[PDB]
């Protein structure tokens, strides 16, 4: 759990808020994605997916 690395920042979950990309199904940290806890989008597509 705690040490599982999935985000493109190559750093682990570590209990941090995360959001799953709807296109590549990768868990990304909210901070890395530039998303606030108070304003989570209903559909999330990560930057890697957006860059083609």
């Amino acid at each position: 759990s705690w040490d599982l690395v999935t985000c493109f920042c190559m750093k682990p979950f570590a209990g941090r808020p995360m959001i799953e990309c709807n296109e590549c199904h990768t868990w990304i940290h909210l901070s890395c994605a530039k998303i606030r806890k108070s304003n989570v989008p209903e559909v999330f597509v990560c930057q890697k997916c957006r860059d083609s």
Partner: peptide, 6 residues
């Protein structure tokens, strides 16, 4: 979105 720890 499918989130955790939010």
């Amino acid at each position: 979105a499918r989130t955790k720890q939010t």
